[PDB]
TrEMBL record:
Binding site for GDP: 53-55, 58, 85-86, 140, 146
CC per GO annotation: Golgi apparatus; membrane
Coiled coil region boundaries: none
GO biological process, one term: protein O-linked glycosylation
Keyword flag Isomerase: no
Binding site for Mn(2+): 173, 322
Cystine pairs: 180-334, 256-354, 328-337
Name of the molecule in the record: Alpha-1,2-mannosyltransferase (Ktr4), putative
Family membership: Belongs to the glycosyltransferase 15 family.
Organism of this sequence: Aspergillus fumigatus (strain CBS 144.89 / FGSC A1163 / CEA10)
Keyword Transmembrane recorded: no
GO terms assigned for molecular function: alpha-1,2-mannosyltransferase activity; metal ion binding
Keyword field: Glycosyltransferase, Metal-binding, Signal, Transferase
Length: 365
């Protein structure tokens, strides 16, 4: 039912999001019988934050997103917002953001050492490969800042001092929508089940952004054979049954990834020996700059090799949109999205859904 449709892979045959979609099983922490007051010193909140790497110029789009996340979820639970930026935030940014939430807002700068390219990266080599990707890649002109952002999300956010006493994060981007009321504490849902990571959307990537990522990953694994987990996602990571030309073009990696603009995650996974050694290996290989390795494929590969796949969760009940893709469940808690409609735009977008592979090789849990 959740298998691939062919006409040429053409997306999912029958989207599970069409099924009546409710809450996960087990105990859930509710706002109506706990202390989730925004300024309570004895609240039911665990050590978690809503986080966002964002620019001053994206303020209006950030505010739209905050309104959705607050209305659907955080107005009841009042977890803090922590904003990150390589540059200082304006006073207008601080005032407008704090006005949209009863929770505490924090405003952090990314340190130069977590943002600047490392000393070993040759900037002339960067510029040469960037010019080629600019020429080849659809609706894409290269920016150094994009590479710095990918590297920051891949290896640096979990090392920021502001997050030292936090264990869980919910990553948020500007200009995204949330469609469904969520009536349980998602962070304590994660914590009580020892979950590592949560996603809403699962996509193919552009192989041109990651051609040596899998080769470099295999090198890392050969040097560290004890790191591979037993409940791993090798089948999903190496799948070639849906779009074999992607897997060939990315030299053994399917290119499928959790779409990282949305993430609910355990910071201590990424801080761990295995993942962080993987990041440092990739950092020294140079592909964050000489290629355009996204944090999504890097997170996805790291999770798929080093996490317990049983501890990765599809948040099917969180209605979500970052242009042009959707996770819209069939639930009376949702409005303003079409259940099971994966994309908005041209029909060639349908083939970008990788869930039929993920659900086959890993599952729908
Ligand atoms: N502070 C800062 N944030 C950035 C920069 N580049 C990207 N971002 C943020 O990183 C996330 C991803 O960037 P975005 O432009 O949405 O890329 P896309 O979602 O892949 O198109 C968003 O939350 C952006 O606000 C940057 O140079 N500085
Ligand atoms: Mn974005
Ligand atoms: Na309450
Ligand atoms: Na281009």
């Amino acid at each position: 039912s959740h298998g691939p449709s062919f006409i040429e892979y053409n997306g999912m045959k029958r989207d599970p999001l069409l099924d009546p979609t409710g809450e996960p099983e087990g105990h859930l922490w509710r706002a109506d019988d706990n202390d989730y007051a925004p300024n309570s010193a004895h609240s039911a909140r665990t050590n978690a934050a809503l986080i966002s790497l964002v620019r001053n110029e994206e303020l209006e789009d950030l505010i739209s997103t905050m309104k959705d996340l607050e209305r659907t979820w955080n107005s009841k639970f009042n977890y803090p917002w922590i904003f990150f930026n390589d540059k200082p935030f304006t006073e207008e940014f601080k005032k407008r953001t704090q006005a949209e939430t009863k929770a505490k807002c924090y405003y952090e700068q990314v340190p130069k050492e977590h943002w600047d390219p490392p000393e070993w990266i040759n900037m002339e080599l960067f510029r040469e490969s960037a010019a080629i990707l600019t020429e080849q890649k659809i609706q894409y002109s290269d920016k150094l800042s994009y590479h710095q952002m990918c590297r920051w999300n891949s290896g640096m956010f979990y090392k920021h001092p502001a997050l030292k006493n936090y264990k869980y994060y919910w990553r948020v981007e500007p200009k995204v929508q949330f469609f469904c009321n969520v009536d349980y504490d998602v962070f304590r849902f994660m914590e009580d089940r020892n979950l590592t990571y949560g996603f809403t959307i699962n996509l193919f990537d552009d192989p041109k952004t990651v051609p040596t990522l899998w080769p470099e990953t295999k090198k890392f694994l050969a040097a560290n054979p004890s790191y591979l987990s037993s409940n791993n996602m090798m089948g999903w990571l190496t799948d070639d049954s849906l779009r074999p030309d992607h897997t060939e073009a990315a030299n053994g990696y399917s290119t499928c990834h959790f779409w990282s603009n949305f993430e609910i995650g355990d910071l201590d996974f990424f801080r761990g020996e295995q993942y962080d050694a993987y990041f440092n290996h990739l950092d020294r290989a140079g592909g964050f700059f000489y290629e355009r390795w996204g944090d999504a494929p890097v997170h996805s590969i790291g999770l798929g090799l080093f996490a317990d796949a049983a501890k990765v969760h599809w948040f099917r009940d969180i209605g979500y949109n970052h242009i042009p893709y959707y996770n819209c469940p069939n639930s009376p808690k949702c409005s303003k999205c079409t259940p099971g409609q994966f994309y908005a735009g041209a029909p060639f977008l349908a083939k970008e859904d990788c869930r039929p592979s993920y659900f086959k090789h890993v599952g729908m849990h």
